Write an enzyme that holds these catalytic residues in place. Structure first.
Site, PDB file in Angstrom:
ATOM      1  N   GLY A  11       0.779  -1.226   0.000  1.00 54.84           N
ATOM      2  CA  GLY A  11       0.000   0.000   0.000  1.00 54.84           C
ATOM      3  C   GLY A  11       0.811   1.275   0.000  1.00 54.84           C
ATOM      4  O   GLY A  11       2.036   1.262  -0.143  1.00 54.84           O
ATOM      5  N   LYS A  60      10.021 -13.029   6.525  1.00 55.54           N
ATOM      6  CA  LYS A  60       9.107 -12.113   5.848  1.00 55.54           C
ATOM      7  C   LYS A  60       8.946 -10.871   6.713  1.00 55.54           C
ATOM      8  O   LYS A  60       8.623 -10.974   7.901  1.00 55.54           O
ATOM      9  CB  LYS A  60       7.715 -12.741   5.569  1.00 55.54           C
ATOM     10  CG  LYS A  60       6.861 -11.862   4.667  1.00 55.54           C
ATOM     11  CD  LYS A  60       5.550 -12.490   4.309  1.00 55.54           C
ATOM     12  CE  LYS A  60       4.770 -11.637   3.329  1.00 55.54           C
ATOM     13  NZ  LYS A  60       3.471 -12.270   2.981  1.00 55.54           N
ATOM     14  N   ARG A  95      -6.388   1.813  13.698  1.00 53.20           N
ATOM     15  CA  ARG A  95      -5.641   1.660  12.426  1.00 53.20           C
ATOM     16  C   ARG A  95      -4.133   1.472  12.620  1.00 53.20           C
ATOM     17  O   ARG A  95      -3.478   0.940  11.722  1.00 53.20           O
ATOM     18  CB  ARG A  95      -5.892   2.848  11.480  1.00 53.20           C
ATOM     19  CG  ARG A  95      -7.033   2.619  10.477  1.00 53.20           C
ATOM     20  CD  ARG A  95      -7.360   3.894   9.711  1.00 53.20           C
ATOM     21  NE  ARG A  95      -8.585   3.814   8.904  1.00 53.20           N
ATOM     22  CZ  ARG A  95      -9.755   4.350   9.255  1.00 53.20           C
ATOM     23  NH1 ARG A  95      -9.890   4.962  10.428  1.00 53.20           N
ATOM     24  NH2 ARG A  95     -10.804   4.261   8.442  1.00 53.20           N
ATOM     25  N   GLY A 113       1.224   4.503   2.403  1.00 48.14           N
ATOM     26  CA  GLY A 113       1.052   5.110   3.717  1.00 48.14           C
ATOM     27  C   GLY A 113       1.093   6.626   3.673  1.00 48.14           C
ATOM     28  O   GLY A 113       0.674   7.239   2.682  1.00 48.14           O
ATOM     29  N   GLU A 114       1.595   7.247   4.749  1.00 46.57           N
ATOM     30  CA  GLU A 114       1.687   8.707   4.831  1.00 46.57           C
ATOM     31  C   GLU A 114       2.882   9.224   4.013  1.00 46.57           C
ATOM     32  O   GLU A 114       2.693   9.931   3.018  1.00 46.57           O
ATOM     33  CB  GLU A 114       1.753   9.178   6.301  1.00 46.57           C
ATOM     34  N   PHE A 115       4.105   8.841   4.425  1.00 45.68           N
ATOM     35  CA  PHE A 115       5.361   9.247   3.798  1.00 45.68           C
ATOM     36  C   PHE A 115       5.555   8.639   2.405  1.00 45.68           C
ATOM     37  O   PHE A 115       6.117   9.294   1.521  1.00 45.68           O
ATOM     38  CB  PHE A 115       6.539   8.904   4.717  1.00 45.68           C
ATOM     39  N   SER A 146       5.385   4.428   0.197  1.00 41.97           N
ATOM     40  CA  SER A 146       5.055   3.019   0.064  1.00 41.97           C
ATOM     41  C   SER A 146       5.459   2.124   1.217  1.00 41.97           C
ATOM     42  O   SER A 146       6.440   2.385   1.917  1.00 41.97           O
ATOM     43  CB  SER A 146       5.646   2.466  -1.228  1.00 41.97           C
ATOM     44  OG  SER A 146       5.075   3.108  -2.355  1.00 41.97           O
ATOM     45  N   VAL A 147       4.668   1.061   1.403  1.00 43.06           N
ATOM     46  CA  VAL A 147       4.922  -0.047   2.310  1.00 43.06           C
ATOM     47  C   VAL A 147       4.961  -1.290   1.399  1.00 43.06           C
ATOM     48  O   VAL A 147       3.995  -1.566   0.687  1.00 43.06           O
ATOM     49  CB  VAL A 147       3.928  -0.209   3.478  1.00 43.06           C
ATOM     50  CG1 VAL A 147       4.298  -1.416   4.350  1.00 43.06           C
ATOM     51  CG2 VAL A 147       3.836   1.059   4.324  1.00 43.06           C
ATOM     52  N   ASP A 169      -0.158   9.243  17.939  1.00 46.41           N
ATOM     53  CA  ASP A 169      -1.107   8.843  16.883  1.00 46.41           C
ATOM     54  C   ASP A 169      -1.788   7.466  17.179  1.00 46.41           C
ATOM     55  O   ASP A 169      -1.905   6.618  16.304  1.00 46.41           O
ATOM     56  CB  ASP A 169      -0.444   8.896  15.474  1.00 46.41           C
ATOM     57  CG  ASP A 169      -1.412   8.782  14.295  1.00 46.41           C
ATOM     58  OD1 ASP A 169      -2.599   9.175  14.449  1.00 46.41           O
ATOM     59  OD2 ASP A 169      -0.988   8.289  13.227  1.00 46.41           O
ATOM     60  N   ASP A 216       3.307   2.495  14.746  1.00 45.84           N
ATOM     61  CA  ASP A 216       3.266   3.839  14.146  1.00 45.84           C
ATOM     62  C   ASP A 216       3.369   5.013  15.148  1.00 45.84           C
ATOM     63  O   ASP A 216       2.630   5.998  15.032  1.00 45.84           O
ATOM     64  CB  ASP A 216       2.012   4.004  13.261  1.00 45.84           C
ATOM     65  CG  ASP A 216       2.272   4.013  11.769  1.00 45.84           C
ATOM     66  OD1 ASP A 216       3.444   4.185  11.368  1.00 45.84           O
ATOM     67  OD2 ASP A 216       1.303   3.858  11.002  1.00 45.84           O
TER      68      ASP A 216
HETATM   69  C1  LIG Z   1      -1.164  -7.203   6.026  1.00 41.39           C
HETATM   70  N1  LIG Z   1      -0.043  -6.795   6.852  1.00 41.39           N
HETATM   71  C2  LIG Z   1       0.543  -5.593   6.822  1.00 41.39           C
HETATM   72  N2  LIG Z   1       0.099  -4.644   5.977  1.00 41.39           N
HETATM   73  C3  LIG Z   1       0.691  -3.447   5.953  1.00 41.39           C
HETATM   74  O1  LIG Z   1       0.139  -2.617   5.064  1.00 41.39           O
HETATM   75  C4  LIG Z   1       0.746  -1.294   4.920  1.00 41.39           C
HETATM   76  C5  LIG Z   1       0.025  -0.345   5.882  1.00 41.39           C
HETATM   77  C6  LIG Z   1      -0.391   0.842   5.037  1.00 41.39           C
HETATM   78  C7  LIG Z   1      -0.649   0.283   3.709  1.00 41.39           C
HETATM   79  C8  LIG Z   1       0.446  -0.761   3.517  1.00 41.39           C
HETATM   80  N3  LIG Z   1       1.727  -3.030   6.693  1.00 41.39           N
HETATM   81  C9  LIG Z   1       2.151  -3.987   7.530  1.00 41.39           C
HETATM   82  C10 LIG Z   1       1.637  -5.269   7.657  1.00 41.39           C
HETATM   83  N4  LIG Z   1       2.332  -5.978   8.626  1.00 41.39           N
HETATM   84  C11 LIG Z   1       3.233  -5.121   9.049  1.00 41.39           C
HETATM   85  N5  LIG Z   1       3.182  -3.904   8.430  1.00 41.39           N
HETATM   86  C12 LIG Z   1       4.046  -2.740   8.676  1.00 41.39           C
HETATM   87  C13 LIG Z   1       3.325  -1.579   9.333  1.00 41.39           C
HETATM   88  C14 LIG Z   1       2.770  -1.665  10.600  1.00 41.39           C
HETATM   89  F1  LIG Z   1       2.891  -2.838  11.252  1.00 41.39           F
HETATM   90  C15 LIG Z   1       2.107  -0.632  11.228  1.00 41.39           C
HETATM   91  C16 LIG Z   1       1.984   0.576  10.558  1.00 41.39           C
HETATM   92  C17 LIG Z   1       2.518   0.728   9.288  1.00 41.39           C
HETATM   93  C18 LIG Z   1       3.169  -0.347   8.716  1.00 41.39           C
HETATM   94  F2  LIG Z   1       3.695  -0.196   7.476  1.00 41.39           F
END
Ligand SMILES: CNc1nc(OC2CCCC2)nc2c1ncn2Cc1c(F)cccc1F
Length: 269
Positions: free
Chosen positions: A27, A48, A154, A29-31, A33-34, A150, A168
Site C-alpha cells: 500500500g 518475511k 488503524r 502510507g503517509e510518507f 510506500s509499504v 497517533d 506507528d
Molecule cells: C497485512 N499486513 C501488513 N500490511 C501493511 O500494510 C501497509 C500499511 C499501510 C498500507 C500498507 N503493513 C504492515 C503489515 N504488517 C506489518 N506492516 C508494517 C506496518 C505496521 F505494522 C504498522 C503501521 C505501518 C506499517 F507499514
C-alpha cells in the site's frame, strides 16, 4: 554515558541493504510506500518483513529509529532495523523494517468481522482482550516516558497468535487540551486510547457520527463525548469515559486503565 548508550543503539539499528530483498507494494502510507520484504537473518534463514519507505532529518530519523529498536514488549511492535537508500536525484530514501503481520491492522480486522468472508463475529471477551493488549503496550511506552501521538485502531497490529501490538509511534482522536494549546502529554495518549477502545467496542465505527471535523473542538468544549455503544457494558463505558475527563490530571494512567480492563475481563463468564 547517555552518549555512549545512543552510539550503541545507532550501530544496532542499521541493516545492510544486501540482507534485504523487496517484494510487492502492500500500500501507500503517509510518507510513501509499504512493501513486502525478505530479511536475511544471522542464522542463514530469511524472514518475511514489511518495509516502510519515506543530513539533520536523516540523523533525527536514525536517532528516533535507534530508540524504537530498543523497545522490548510483546504489545509494542518491534523495529527490526533501518536502511538508507539514495534517489537518482540525490534525495535520501529512509526505509524502516518491521515484522509482517498477516492479519494486518486492528481497524480493518474489526470491519472485516462484520462481513461474511471476513473473520467471524468477535465476542466481547476478545474485544476486551484487544483493549488489554493495547493498554499493556501503552503502559510500557508511558513508563519509558515515550509519547505515541497517533494512537488509533488503524495503528494497532494483529499478530498470528491474535495478540495486539501498538505501532506507528486525525482530529477525532486528539484530546481537548491538545486542540486548544497544542500541548501533548501521556494523558493526551490516554484520551486517544479511550477513542481507540470505542472504535473496538463499535467494531470499527468512525468516532462522532454526525459531527464534522471542523466542529470537533466546540463539541468537546460544551462537554459532549463519544456516545455509549449498543451492548457495551456500563463498566467498559465508564472506563472509556474516564479517558475523556476535561482536566488531564483527573484521567487515569495507562497502568490504572490496564488494571481496570483486566479485572472486567476476568469477571466475564
Ligand atoms: C497485512 N499486513 C501488513 N500490511 C501493511 O500494510 C501497509 C500499511 C499501510 C498500507 C500498507 N503493513 C504492515 C503489515 N504488517 C506489518 N506492516 C508494517 C506496518 C505496521 F505494522 C504498522 C503501521 C505501518 C506499517 F507499514
Amino acid at each position: 554515558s547517555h552518549m555512549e548508550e545512543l552510539q550503541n543503539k545507532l550501530e544496532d539499528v542499521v541493516i545492510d541493504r544486501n540482507l534485504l530483498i523487496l517484494g510487492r507494494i502492500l500500500g501507500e502510507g503517509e510518507f510513501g510506500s509499504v512493501m513486502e520484504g525478505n530479511l536475511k537473518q544471522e542464522d542463514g534463514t530469511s524472514l518475511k518483513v514489511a518495509v516502510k519507505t519515506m543530513q539533520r532529518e536523516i540523523e533525527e530519523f536514525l536517532s528516533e529509529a535507534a530508540c524504537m529498536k530498543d523497545f522490548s514488549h510483546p504489545n509494542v511492535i518491534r523495529l527490526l532495523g533501518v536502511c538508507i537508500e539514495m534517489s537518482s536525484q540525490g534525495i535520501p530514501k529512509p526505509m524502516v523494517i518491521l515484522p509482517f503481520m498477516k492479519y494486518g491492522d486492528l481497524h480493518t480486522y474489526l470491519l472485516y468481522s462484520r462481513l461474511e468472508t471476513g473473520p467471524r463475529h468477535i465476542p466481547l471477551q476478545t474485544l476486551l482482550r484487544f483493549m488489554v493488549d493495547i493498554a499493556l503496550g501503552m503502559e510500557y511506552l508511558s513508563n519509558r516516558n515515550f509519547l505515541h501521538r497517533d494512537l488509533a485502531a488503524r495503528n494497532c497490529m494483529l499478530r498470528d497468535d491474535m495478540t495486539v501490538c501498538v505501532a506507528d509511534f486525525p482530529v477525532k482522536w486528539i484530546a481537548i487540551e491538545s486542540l486548544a494549546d497544542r500541548v501533548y502529554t501521556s494523558k493526551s495518549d490516554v484520551w486517544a486510547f479511550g477513542v481507540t477502545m470505542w472504535e473496538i467496542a463499535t467494531r470499527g465505527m468512525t468516532p462522532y457520527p454526525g459531527v464534522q471535523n471542523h466542529e470537533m473542538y466546540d463539541y468537546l468544549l460544551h462537554g459532549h463525548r463519544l456516545k455509549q455503544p449498543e451492548d457495551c457494558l456500563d463498566e467498559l463505558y465508564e472506563i472509556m469515559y474516564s479517558c475523556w475527563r476535561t482536566d488531564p490530571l483527573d484521567r487515569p494512567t495507562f497502568s490504572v486503565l490496564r488494571l481496570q480492563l483486566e479485572r472486567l475481563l476476568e469477571s466475564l463468564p
